[PDB]
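Hey all, sorry for the wall of text incoming. These are the four entities for the joint prediction.
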Amino acid sequence: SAFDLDVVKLTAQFVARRQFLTQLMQKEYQFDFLRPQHSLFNYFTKLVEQYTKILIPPSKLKKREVLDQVCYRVEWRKKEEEEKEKERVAYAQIDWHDFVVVETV
Amino acid sequence: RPGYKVTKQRDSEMGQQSYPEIAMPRHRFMSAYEQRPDRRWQYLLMAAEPYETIAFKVPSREIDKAEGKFWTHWNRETKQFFLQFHFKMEKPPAPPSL
Amino acid sequence: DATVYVGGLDEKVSEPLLWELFLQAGPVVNTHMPKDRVTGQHQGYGFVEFLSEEDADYAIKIMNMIKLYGKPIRVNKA
Amino acid sequence: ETILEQQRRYHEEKERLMDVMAKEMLTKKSTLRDQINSDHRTRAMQDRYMEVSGNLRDLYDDKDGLRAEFYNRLKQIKEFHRKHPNEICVPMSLKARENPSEEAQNLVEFTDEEGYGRYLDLHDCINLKASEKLDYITYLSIFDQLFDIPKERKNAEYKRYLEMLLEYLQDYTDRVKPLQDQNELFFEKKWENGTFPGWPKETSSALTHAGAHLDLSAFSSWEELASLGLDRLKSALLALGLGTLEERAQRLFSTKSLESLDTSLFAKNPKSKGTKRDTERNKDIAFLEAQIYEYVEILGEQRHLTHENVQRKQARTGEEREEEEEEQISESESEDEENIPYWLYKLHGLNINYNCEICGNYTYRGPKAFQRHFAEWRHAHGMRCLGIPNTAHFANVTQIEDAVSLWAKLKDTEEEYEDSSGNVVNKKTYEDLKRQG
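and here's what came out:
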């Protein structure tokens, strides 16, 4: 898959700085991932974004703090399933023929 | 349209004072075709462990039988009927059904 | 694994159709199929010791395909 | 090489690591909590979570199971943070290529190993679930950092230093407990009520060794806290404060071991030949003393915990002390993550010593039994896996060697070419000359 990866990431590199690809398509079935139809397209939208991000702080990162951050990320069902199970059991296990009605609607 | 609503009340800490053993009420629609003579109508049976079962006759073929009320969330509990249209005020011991 | 436990059988089955039956797969070296004395009849569960363990693990894989008197036969390790 | 790709991969790896140590902090909040608590008493500003969270071992709603493992993961997270710091550092420091990417088109290879090998390179947990340690730190072992008597930070082993101390005081009037009583001295006592004269050689040497020990123990037991930060903090406290000792009566003490009336004479004494001499000779010792002081303060809970241990063990019996030691040992060497017919046997020929060589040099007690070995699962496994096929032929000899030559003992047509010389010629050869003809 090295080929696909490389072309995705390259067209993503250039696309990150969007007119060169739209010209390439008309100039030159290799870049079929450009259309949102081709599944890989999605991952493409990722890579570009990522590169777009590298362009953000092109600024140094001077990050205790890392720890605090990982904690906050951490911070950012089973029992229920169990109770439900119990309910299913009991519902399945009671006499629905022990009737004693009062009225009607 | 028109729908039915039932308000069932339970004991006031009178006898339930005497072990997390299944410690909500459950409802089911039963056909009268099976009884311990006559038949031909449905019953909205409601049951709780200690107390005795209760039934309500439903001559109308269909009432309040809604169409995708909530947005398809899947905790079946017991069945679509129970989650769809029941409430169990466990703090006051009041079971509402509609 | 050399031995297996076998459930769900009919007393017309005996130690012989087990002998013959499981050696169809691989030879039963030691057969045990209780005869109950009191009412003189079988409950239908079995224990089988083989030559070594490989016989019996293949036996776990293949083994529970047997059907005794139209009915299902339990085979598990022991 | 397009720097964009490199910087990208860097930010991505950093993300991966943060995510890993965050997953960890998630499964067992103690990892952070523990750490943070200690941090609290070193850098007072630090904000710490609600006590309830700490106790119930929960981060938001779910209370996690209480967990050697805590410490382990803390050291693992330590190396992770090291990697992260490195990457952060290096980081701080089109058609042309797409054409060359066409190189070697014909490779039948599946490539799913960039984010998976990294994600995997830094995740929890062997084949499936045996060792909590990540592939990143697979050769990380705490027992090479903590002794058994320290119990991964539970206690600090001071018996050794009690020995050295006996050697220092040149007597035996000093008991383990009286020695600990001495240690307790360590803001003013260790300075104004010294066990020995602070200008004694043996004493200063001892104090050095001990200080070093306490410090290494400190940072050893709290990997997660920035060591350099703490070091620098202490150093600056040493330089900026430590006429820090003031008395309303005697004035200002100097670690020259003399007091001074007023700050004035104190200052004009810090340039004198005496103080120059002393501060120039006893600097390292004074500083080490100070470190012993502050590090022992930061470890008050461990000091107390150990002293307690001492008194306990001391008040044990023999059996008690033994069983306790057993416990410490087990804790030390345990995985950080848990998953009549007498003449009858002679007559029948049994209970007589015999051996099969091919099977694990195994012993057999009977000749009928060994004769039954010839048809067996394991015996045939040794043969067949050895490359000697299982059949009767070999159902005699035991030694591995001879059956190899026996198995060697176990394991051409003429197609008439047209020149009448090919009557020696093989079938396949003449077919090859069919393809040639």
